[PDB]
Design a protein around this ligand. Sequence first.
Ligand SMILES: *[C@@H]1O[C@H](CO)[C@@H](O)[C@H](O)[C@H]1NC(C)=O
Ligand SMILES: [Cl-]
Ligand SMILES: [Cu+2]
Ligand SMILES: [Cu+2]
Ligand SMILES: [Mg+2]
Ligand SMILES: [O]
Ligand SMILES: [O]
Lengths: 325, 325
Amino acid sequence: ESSMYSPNAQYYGSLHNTAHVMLGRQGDPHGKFNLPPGVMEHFETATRDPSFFRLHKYMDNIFKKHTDSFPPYTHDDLEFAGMAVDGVAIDGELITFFDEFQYSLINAVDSGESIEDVEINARVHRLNHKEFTYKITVSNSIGSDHLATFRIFLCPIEDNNGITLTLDKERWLCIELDKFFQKVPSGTHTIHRSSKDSSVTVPDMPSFHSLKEQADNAVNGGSDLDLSAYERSCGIPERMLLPKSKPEGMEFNLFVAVTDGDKDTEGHNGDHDHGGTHAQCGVHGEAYPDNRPLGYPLERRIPDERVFDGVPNIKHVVVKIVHHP
Amino acid sequence: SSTAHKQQNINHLLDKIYEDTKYPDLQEIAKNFNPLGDTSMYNDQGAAAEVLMKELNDHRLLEQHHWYSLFNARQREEALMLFAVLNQCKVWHCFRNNAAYFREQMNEGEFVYALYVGVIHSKLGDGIVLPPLYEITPHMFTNSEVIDKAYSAKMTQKAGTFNVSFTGTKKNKEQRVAYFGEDIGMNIHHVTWHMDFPFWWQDSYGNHLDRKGELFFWVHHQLTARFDFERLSNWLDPVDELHWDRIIREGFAPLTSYKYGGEFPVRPDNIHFEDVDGVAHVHDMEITENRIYEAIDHGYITATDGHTIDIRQPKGIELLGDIIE
Ligand SMILES: *[C@@H]1O[C@H](CO)[C@@H](O)[C@H](O)[C@H]1NC(C)=O
Ligand SMILES: [Cl-]
Ligand SMILES: [Cu+2]
Ligand SMILES: [Cu+2]
Ligand SMILES: [Mg+2]
Ligand SMILES: [O]
Ligand SMILES: [O]
């Protein structure tokens, strides 16, 4: 990155953070023109720049050399014995669209002495999607109810040239849609999971005006303000859960791995509140709740797809996403 | 064997160095002295004299009237063979007689080098003042135009004093600071520092050169900083650093010649480094540079058997000078 956890910054330096500055300053690399830092030199702005994603794919490939160095998972590594994913379906069509969102610009302008504010807003078009629900039918033949981790990914079927991808060529392209822990009772049952409840996403932030109104209303009148209804600001926006897709529709693989929740949460508390964004943003003030490597079970090479196909607790199905312009 | 006689002996040995000696006593010694005749005059009982005499008798030494470079490995080895003999002499008559004998047998550039470092590094040399090399070998300090006027003055048998101008033209901004690197005394400072602190020194020659590797850093740091102060004085920016993968912006025409060997070569402006046959590939320089920086950023130098030598300590800079020179 590097962080202050680095055991040897004198030798390994700070590749990623220095790269942000190297890239950000390429419009004036010698300071001759006195230009200010580039968009890459703030986390507020870095993703606006196309080169952000070229830099971060470069960095991602460094990590991938390490993750690719481990032996592929075996059947015995992956099997959650007695747990079979019988079916994966979605209740509701997968549909994206653009809608409009407003935020205040008042703090950007200069207010005089004794000059009344006027409302000044920006309106942006933003991606969004319709609500849907996963229906994951699972057969538990273990003999007792068991905690399971449900890991949900969206994977490309073909590339932009129309070439069908192998699982090994898909896995590093898959995007995480959800991760959750749920007790699966003995027998056959359908788990339902709302798109709204994804542990990858958080809702749009409340506006500054709304926070002022709610705080002021609570303070005025001796009313206990409680905002325990809102989430953290870390997390993919809920509205961006799905890729845009195409008006003609595109098909993707919806990949579901159901894994041993006891093993995954050992040393923690599996059936406890982990907040709404633990997949990539963790749990405020607590240990990370999932012991598996990030990306499990897609983070190692899969040279032989037969291994995955032979594991009853892994299943993928084809889903279609349609963009409404 | 007194200082007056030793100084006179050195004066005579260095006089008209491109011709056979004109002093009857030195001619007699060169004719009749046997470097192997009485090994009791050496601290090594003649070992070094045997090595040099064998090379001489096998016709393996560089001819007289030929360019000499201390950076040429074999020519340096030959000069150091004579240094080794002089350095083993217990008394002055050994030093003088061997110098006179090999003056008439060995290349003049090798001989002058060996005699200077022999005087400097032998206690027998104490109290001797070496003549300035710009009067012993003026070609190495005097542009070709002035030497030609000297050659003309000699061809015509007429005395004269001839003005030396700096190299280049007024269109060449680098000429503004030619008075620094072309100063004959600055050149003597530089050659003499390396004669005092030679990279070929081994303590088997008799003593240790204290802190040599750190003094190597320091003397060149001061040359660099002093040159930049002249640039600043002449409305020039500081020098850039060289890099093996970038052009050397500033070329150079010395307008100087060897006494034997021809004109010194010129370098055009704005050239990329090319591999030099028999020396190194440009890529080898980059690798060597990388390895040195690896030691610096590790905080240790790696020994031949792989064990670490800590440089996070006051002698680290000295060890770096040892490995960098
Ligand atoms: C050489 O320089 C001296 C003084 O530096 C001057 O008197 C003389 O005119 C110069 N000679 C020529 C040929 O320019
Ligand atoms: Cl059911
Ligand atoms: Cu980054
Ligand atoms: Cu030097
Ligand atoms: Mg030759
Ligand atoms: O980033
Ligand atoms: O980052």
